[PDB]
Amino acid sequence: MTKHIKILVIGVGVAGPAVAYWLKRFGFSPVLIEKSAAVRKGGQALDIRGIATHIAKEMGIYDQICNMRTQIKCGRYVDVKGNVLHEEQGETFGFRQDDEVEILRGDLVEILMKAIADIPCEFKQSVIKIEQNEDSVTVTYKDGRVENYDLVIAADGIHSATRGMVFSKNEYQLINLGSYVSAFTIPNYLGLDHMELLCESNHKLVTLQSDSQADKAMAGFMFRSKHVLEDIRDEQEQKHFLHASFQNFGWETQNILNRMPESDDFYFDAITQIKMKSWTKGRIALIGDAAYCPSPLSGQGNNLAFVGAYILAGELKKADGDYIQAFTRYNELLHPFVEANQQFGVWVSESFLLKDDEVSKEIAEARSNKILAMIKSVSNSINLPQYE
């Protein structure tokens, strides 16, 4: 029966715990593994918008998520001289409305994990080899130990090890949107109070905010550049590149970068999308960022994770565990919605920053209203199946 189907879920992020929840709810018995020692605190702020809110509510975690929501009261577009060009309330500023809500990743994962306390999960575990035939998937762990599963569902992030292990270069594209993103936490030297400031130029923008930690501020950088690092993983090269890339930006960049060396949660990566004709191969399926990351410019990453988790578990349910039928349904039903939200992210990468002109209240406001409407449109551009 479905209960006795062995399913390995790799990655305790959003998609992994999400798909584990729905699989369990739909009569299956999944198990989770995680490379990290434990759930990482805080981190990037995730949007739960569109249909993802409906899924969250059915999961019985929506009120919990709201209890832990970000509490930015005010967002401001400012020029390099610190003048306020355009101001908006927090939710509107983040292009959210209605029941939509923003929550830090770590907080959301903790909530997700509490919702699946009955599901076996093993941290500090890593898969080093995967092999499958028609009957089974053989998983080799770090210590050389081996186990067999009927199915493996990998939710191990945009830099998916599993994707590289299972798929060839012809079976997926890493789509570069010609821009970089960086973020780190610093002392709230400005004394921001549940407020975010955003300053921008023709190719770059810098954000600075404080929210749930009063004596801390989260700095953000987004910019376009065709430059390539000799080693994109080299944190020292990242900080040198970022500093040199913003040396003449003005505004608070000097004050922010002066505090960068002492920040301990530094993050830097290219803005990238994962494009796959098929998210699956035999008994293995990718999900979440590993399968179809829409990049931070889309704001749809979380949305796609929840929807993917719901549909995949659903189609497996309807197929009574027949993964071949389910995986096909998984690819067909979900791709257009993924592609829609990915194209939105691409659009943001190409037209959010003013090409020629300097920002003003009129532009900031019109652009804000336009993005709010458009994101609402794409985030709801799928008709969610009812598996129950």
Ligand X SMILES: Cc1cc2nc3c(=O)[nH]c(=O)nc-3n(C[C@H](O)[C@H](O)[C@H](O)COP(=O)(O)OP(=O)(O)OC[C@H]3O[C@@H](n4cnc5c(N)ncnc54)[C@H](O)[C@@H]3O)c2cc1C
x-or-dash string of contact with ligand X, 86-125, rule CB under 6 A = -------------------x--------------------
User: Least distance (Å) from ligand X to the CB of residue 113?
Assistant: 11
Total chain residues near ligand X (CB under 6 A): 34
Closer by beta carbon to ligand X, 36 or else 97? 36
User: Could you say which of 155, 218, 286, 334 contacts ligand X (CB under 6 A)?
Assistant: 155
* Amino acid occupying residue 344: F
217 is in an annotated binding site: no
Kindly tell me which of 101 and 192 has the beta carbon lying closer to ligand X: 101
Tell me, letter by letter, the H, E, C secondary structure of the chain. CHHHCEEEEECCCCHHHHHHHHHHHCCCEEEEECCCCCCCCCCCEEEECCCHHHHHHHCCCHHHHHHCECCCCEEEEECCCCCEEEEEEHHHHCCCCCCCEEEEHHHHHHHHHHCCCCCCEECCCCEEEEEECCCCEEEEECCCCEEEECEEEECCCCCCHHHHHHCCHHHCEEEEEEEEEEEEEEECCCCCCCEEEEEECCCEEEEEEECCCCCEEEEEEEEECCCCCCCCCCHHHHHHHHHHHCCCCCCCHHHHHCCCCCCCCCEEEEEEEEECCCCEECCEEECCHHHHCCCCCCCCHHHHHHHHHHHHHHHHHHCCCCHHHHHHHHHHHHHHHHHHHHHHHHHHHHHCCCCCCCCCHHHHHHHHHHHHHHHHHHHCCCCCCCCC
To ligand X, the closest distance from the beta carbon of 86 in angstroms equals 20
> Contact, 225 vs 349, CB < 8 A?
no
Minimum distance, C-beta of residue 212 to ligand X, in the bound complex (Å): 16
Q: Do the beta carbons of residue 179 and residue 224 sit within 8 Å? A: yes
CB 76 within 8 A of CB 87: yes
Closer of 105 and 321 to ligand X (Cβ): 105
For residue 62, the minimal CB distance to ligand X (Å) is: 16
Among 9, 11, 239, 327, indicate the residue that binds ligand X (CB under 6 A): 11
Considering the complex, state which of residue 217 and residue 321 has its C-beta at the smaller distance from ligand X. 217
Q: Which of 50, 301, 314, 321 forms a contact with ligand X (CB under 6 A)?
A: 301
For position 59 contacting ligand X by CB under 6 A, the verdict is no
Residues 370 and 361: their CA atoms lie apart, in Å, by 14
Q: How far apart are CA 49 and CA 371, in angstroms?
A: 13
Q: Which is nearer to ligand X, 71 or 84 (CB)?
A: 71
CB of 1 or CB of 37, closer to ligand X: 37
Q: Interface with ligand X includes 202 (CB under 6 A)?
A: no
* CB of residue 200 to ligand X, shortest distance in Å: 17
Let me know: does 112 contact 17? Beta carbons within 8 Å.
yes
Q: Is the dihedral of CA 32, 388, 333, 329 positive or negative?
A: positive
Q: Is 301 annotated as a binding residue?
A: yes
Give the whole-angstrom CA distance, residue 54 versus residue 48. 10
- 345 marked as part of a ligand binding site: no
Find the part of the chain contacting ligand X (CB under 6 A) among 84-92, 131-139, 153-161, 193-201: 153-161
- The residue within the footprint of ligand X, chosen from 5, 12, 338, 364 (CB under 6 A), is 12
Establish if 46 lies at the interface with ligand X (CB under 6 A): yes
Which of the ranges 27-35, 64-72, 116-124, 167-175 carries the binding residues for ligand X, by CB under 6 A? 27-35
Q: Report the residue from 30, 299, 321, 345 that binds ligand X according to the rule CB under 6 A.
A: 299
Q: How far is the CB of 102 from ligand X (least distance, A)?
A: 7
30 interacts with ligand X by CB under 6 A = no
Q: Does 198 help bind ligand X (rule: CB under 6 A)?
A: no
Residue 12 marked in a binding site: yes
**29 annotated to bind ligand:** no
User: Binding-site residues for FAD, please?
Assistant: 12-15, 34-36, 44-47, 105, 267, 289, 296-302
Footprint on this chain of ligand X (rule: CB under 6 A):
10-16, 33-36, 44-47, 105, 126, 155-157, 161, 181, 183, 288-290, 293, 296, 299-303, 305
User: Binding-site residues, please?
Assistant: 12-15, 34-36, 44-47, 105, 267, 289, 296-302
